[PDB]
Design a protein around this ligand. Structure first.
Ligand SMILES: Nc1ncnc2c1ncn2[C@@H]1O[C@H](COP(=O)(O)OP(=O)(O)O)[C@@H](O)[C@H]1O
Ligand SMILES: [Mg+2]
Lengths: 255, 318, 122, 15, 128, 317, 255, 156
């Protein structure tokens, strides 16, 4: 109803796993033929016909949209099981959560390496891209070396550098629940680590830093953020203003 | 099988049911008859059951392993039904104990073919989930009354992904996962620290001290888990002193997590200990804080409060 | 074997392989340094190192010698040793994945056969 | 293992 | 007979693995749909029913008893297996023997870790 | 994705129309509605499709993911029928694209199951091999012409021995492995020179010359790969007068293997290049030879025939 | 027909793997209980019955024969699968070709160790017996020292020497397609390697030596070959003649 | 597999053959830790026989556990003590093989028939470190221990 009328709507299916089960129950009771995992031959179709209904219309139609966040519950991380396989294959990407990650302190437990967005940057603001891009890159670069850390009895300063950038950026990705940030706040924070401001900082402090830093800018600097928002990017100016804002705050921070 | 589901249920009756002050309903679904007898006679010896007067604080319902699938497919309903009464009709807060709810599910599976059904995955009946739903849905607190249900949940072949245990998770608010792997080590209760969860594990609910400690304890165990397989082969030397301290602390915590139950003396050969919430938070807090890097691991094994760990150290000192 | 069991080893051997591989790169580095520093000095898990001397075991001018040598030989030994350890670990990751996939498949078939079997008996 | 399928076409030069 | 008459008996079921097979056979031949691993959906029940009979009667019933020692044959030392777990979940503990232990010189090949007694010391003399 | 999959699909189309006057078909088996429409306008913007005239070089067949199993089951055939015409009626050299071959097989199983037949190993259809062969086999060189098929493959569980993939390989004559890594070197097309293979890479088929060059490019590419580890750690210098040439050349090679597509002219601001087989062998032949050792790396990046490598060097002082 | 009439035929089943899947398709559609790998209970018989038919008749039955070379396609070198084991349990030996070998450039990628010929020794020519006999022996002593390990420093002259034939012999066994050799041609070239006439030589030259040394004796010496071939054995003279023949050819061989 | 699985119960003695062993070139490819006999009882074969037998099995079992490690890291990191079990095991492993008359065409050796006391003996010694000096190869494909000593000389 929203989509069609020039409006935008978001939908969460929680879960598609349970629904598949509901459908399976009916199928088998009706005695239709069972396939792998006892699922009917039209279980794929059940979801595809569902998930396709979400889409971005053309102005000719109202420009309205319907985005979908369907949830799938894997088992012992088996993304290749039946239903997970379908849905993965149907959607434009996936946000992969891990228990190991979670317990390790990474919350949300997003496995960055394995998660994807087919749509990509075509959906990112210029501001975000302005930062997201290098972040994505150092992380990938860390991911290559990460395993070495715990036994890096003598690594060159080249890779030793990526290890550092790695843990900081990683700490930046952490997040509490119930507190979604505005795109402008996210870039400001990301900018801090990405530019190297937190490199000398202690990993144990990044979480505290951000918190306080962000409290500061949300308090004191609502004009720069407004800029960032408005200008949609990080102007050469606002860039310089950020440099001072963090360099002074940091100083303050390590007193 | 044999990881301590029952014993844990036993210690909870002790540490909680006993000081209740409301009713309690214990439904034995598809479990051991021997156990029903053990429990009955225990309730009596402890006045929870009173054969002479009306002071009885607990109603019992039984449908053991020596019954036909039909009885097993229903005892839980019987027990639940009793419990719903004290919830609604009276309303004074009820404690519900079920051991073991898996049995309800396996009961259904046992007659399912004779009911002419195509089997679902893992041999389960196709109506598993729904069957579970219309039942689990009654086991709940309402505005009229409150139920505090502790259900034991069997895990076939030890596979947590098994359709049954798997389907049950959603119905809970708190989950205590026991592990043979842990048990095998002699660590009782064999709870898996990285697979157990509670809806109230929220800073806004238990507070940040509780919260930070818990998470702190979890991080270290996870950290250590990761390293396990590696030092195993490559050895420990190459490890950073930074890293060889977490190996230490973890091993200690791993122990401090154990506890001699009151209901398992016949098992441990140790007097059961009941630790209060603050004694727990503090003891861990300290270990994390490096405040015991001197005592030996063993000192932390099978003890109650941290003090006992310190005492045990001396006793161990020779 | 259990997919849960094979997943363990695999999980681990995958790690051991990366560590091991990492240790060699190191061992090569120091060994580079050593070959150079070695040059002059003559004009004056580490393989079978510590043992070789150990078995056969039962100033300054020379002290710096046995030293300046015993490090080239060591950084040499560790390097090759770790080279083969990952070589081993790789043969293993490849081997285990194979068992993984055989089982993975087998599990699926076995289930499906069970289903079909019960359905067809009605 | 379990989530390998999210790599992908990994051993492709072998096919 | 002994149990109900204040006497004491010990019964060895060697082994319940072959019995289940027999059951499965008898069952399939009657055309009762095969369940998990081909066994009848009620294999558990097949054993529970039986082993529940082993028991200790009160003085009111003669104080007699029936003790059961059922045997189960694993494959590839896999105790987690469905039948092995089915039976482990009925009995008052298990004695698990490994061939590794055996060859190694540990005979009996009892695996301390994996074996248990749900009776505990209550079944031991004070001396022990 | 990210790797030039569509762009490459579009150049091929173009190059088939150009060098063989052959048309192309595009069969989307289990296409995501979103992606179809996106493919449509992408082709359009690049010309391959022309809404105004009659210069379109591709016909598009779609079997969307919402469609029932039977529909997604047939769409490939439909596309096949289409291509067959440009061969059996006009004797051209058609191109058939099936995206993706996996969804074909999958669609097969769904139909099978619905027909109540017992699934076989891994749950696929008992008729897996036949279902595939009755289709694959129509793709060949008859006396009248020939149909060539580019099939997009999805390997399940990364398991090359999975029945689906395994079956499929029984019919493939060559693989074209697009690689994210390569793309990262800025190299495009992002095809992997060491992972991509061909059955016809036989001197007995491509001729000793072609065969040797190829085998030459590959070995060098292989060797350099070895050194790669050394360079980064122990530093690029224990390298011999020999070890230093293998690198240089290889690096030139890796670049010479990249190329500008006409499809990507619209907004690459660079003219496309359709290098000829003769020119291709020659080019690599010489680099291997050592004719351009003096030339600098960047000279070879994104050009056509070696001649351009030379001129680029000029403009590069 | 040929076997039955004192004649001799050769039948190649390419592959038995695909037939088995064809039969399985039939079996499942008929609804016959799928077993191991979903294969019907009688797939072994599908093969045994067929393969039993290859046979060597005695004189009182025509002395004719039927020789079967059935082909089986393994997945990932898994020689333990259901179908491969079945077939192995039928035939009178196997010739396993290795993926490793094939790529490493050894073709025919024949796995010398694994492969077998249960009944063929007796069918073997004396000439070959004469040269081939000490070939697997030599290769036996080479099979060992030839590790996966690419960078290994070795000692011991013997083991060194053993390792040295091994690489030569291995070069002798490589063969292109469409160029089947005459038994006498085989004994000849094999003679060169097994006798030591190639020890003093570099493994990269072996191939080249073969062609050159082969054309040579084919051109000039059809006289000795015919003997070998005719006699069917290597007589003292023939061997004497051969020895010099390798001797001189060597002496003139351009590196 | 249900077939073989259900068969064990009907035997008094079981000779399990192994592809893995066979592939190592050991013939007969009998798995020494998997073959059993009801007769393996001291009161039937005697304690000398019973002790060597269990002796050999325990060393082979021990070697088996070390294998995982040997697999990634080889022997280097092994204890002097452990290395000795490995040597002995690999020598016992080899000494278990033997040429059959029936398999002469393949082994390339003359078949051998070792007498029980010969077997008990040769195995005792190996166990007892009476041959820690000889090379493994000396033990491969032979009859009595005596021949394993000679083979050693010939190997020089
Ligand atoms: N908390 C505990 N402390 C000591 N031993 C324990 C404990 N829990 C279980 N055990 C041992 O495990 C056995 C099985 O426990 P039980 O509760 O019967 O397991 P489950 O009900 O999960 O099958 C007990 O008989 C005892 O020997
Ligand atoms: Mg219990």
């Amino acid at each position: 109803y929203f989509r069609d009328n020039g409006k935008h709507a978001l939908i969460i299916y929680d879960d598609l796993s349970k629904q598949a089960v509901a459908y399976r129950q009916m199928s088998l009771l009706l005695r239709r033929p069972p396939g792998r995992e006892a699922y009917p031959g039209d279980v794929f179709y059940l979801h595809s016909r569902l998930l396709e209904r979400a889409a971005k219309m053309n102005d000719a139609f109202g420009g309205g949209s319907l985005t979908a966040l369907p949830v799938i519950e894997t088992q012992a991380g088996d993304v290749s099981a039946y239903i997970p396989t379908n849905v993965i294959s149907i959607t434009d990407g996936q946000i992969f959560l891990e228990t190991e990650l979670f317990y390790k302190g990474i919350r949300p437990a997003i496995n960055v390496g394995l998660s994807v967005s087919r749509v990509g940057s075509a959906a990112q603001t210029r501001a975000m891209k302005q930062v997201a891009g290098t972040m994505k890159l150092e992380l990938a670069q860390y991911r290559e070396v990460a395993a070495f850390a715990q036994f890096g009895s003598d690594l060159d300063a080249a890779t030793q550098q990526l290890l550092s950038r790695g843990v900081r950026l990683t700490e930046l990705l952490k997040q509490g629940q119930y507190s979604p940030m505005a795109i402008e706040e996210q870039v400001a924070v990301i900018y801090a680590g990405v530019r190297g401001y937190l490199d000398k900082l202690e990993p144990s402090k990044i979480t505290k830093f951000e918190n306080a830093f962000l409290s500061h800018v949300i308090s004191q600097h609502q004009a720069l953020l407004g800029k960032i928002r408005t200008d949609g990017k990080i102007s050469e100016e606002s860039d310089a203003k950020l440099k001072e804002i963090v360099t002074n705050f940091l100083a303050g921070f390590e007193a | 099988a044999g990881v301590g589901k029952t014993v844990l249920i036993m210690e909870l009756i002790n540490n909680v049911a006993k000081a209740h002050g409301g009713y309690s309903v214990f439904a034995g679904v598809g479990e051991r008859t021997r156990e029903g007898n053990d429990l009955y006679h225990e309730m009596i010896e402890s006045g929870v059951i009173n054969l002479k007067d009306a002071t009885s604080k607990v109603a019992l319902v039984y449908g053991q392993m020596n019954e036909p699938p039909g009885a097993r497919a229903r005892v839980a309903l019987t027990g639940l039904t009793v419990a719903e009464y004290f919830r609604d009709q009276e309303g004074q807060d009820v404690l519900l104990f079920i051991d073991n709810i898996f049995r309800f599910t396996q009961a259904g599976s046992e007659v399912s073919a004779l009911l002419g059904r195509i089997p679902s995955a893992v041999g389960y009946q196709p109506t598993l989930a729904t069957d579970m739903g219309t039942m689990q849905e009654r086991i709940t607190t309402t505005k009229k009354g409150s139920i505090t249900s502790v259900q034991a949940i069997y895990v076939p072949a030890d596979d947590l992904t098994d359709p049954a245990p798997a389907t049950t998770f959603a119905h809970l608010d708190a989950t205590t996962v026991l592990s043979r792997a842990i048990a095998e080590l002699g660590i009782y209760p064999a709870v898996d620290p990285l697979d157990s969860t509670s809806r109230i594990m929220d800073p806004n609910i238990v507070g940040s001290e509780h919260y930070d400690v818990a998470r702190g304890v979890q991080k270290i165990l996870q950290d250590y888990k990761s390293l396990q397989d590696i030092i195993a082969i490559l050895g420990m030397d190459e490890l950073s002193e930074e890293d060889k301290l977490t190996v230490s602390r973890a091993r200690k915590i791993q122990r401090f997590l154990s506890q001699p139950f009151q209901v398992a003396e016949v098992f441990t050969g140790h007097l059961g200990k009941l630790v209060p919430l603050k004694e727990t938070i503090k003891g861990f807090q300290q270990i994390l804080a490096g405040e015991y890097d001197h005592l030996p691991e063993q000192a932390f094994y099978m003890v109650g409060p941290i003090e006992e760990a310190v005492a045990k150290a001396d006793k161990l000192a020779e | 074997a259990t997919l849960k069991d094979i997943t363990r080893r695999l999980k681990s051997i995958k790690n051991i392989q990366k560590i091991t591989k990492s240790m060699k790169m190191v061992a090569a580095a120091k060994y580079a340094r050593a070959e150079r520093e070695l040059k002059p000095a003559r004009v004056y898990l580490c393989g079978a190192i510590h043992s070789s001397v150990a078995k056969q075991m039962k100033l300054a001018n020379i002290i710096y010698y046995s030293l300046k040598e015993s490090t080239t030989s060591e950084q040499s030994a560790r390097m090759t040793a770790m080279d083969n350890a990952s070589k081993n670990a790789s043969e293993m990751i490849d081997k285990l994945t194979l068992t993984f996939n055989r089982t993975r498949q087998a599990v699926i078939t076995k289930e499906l056969i069970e289903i079909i079997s019960g359905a067809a008996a009605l | 293992x379990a989530x390998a399928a999210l790599x992908g076409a990994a051993x492709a030069g072998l096919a």
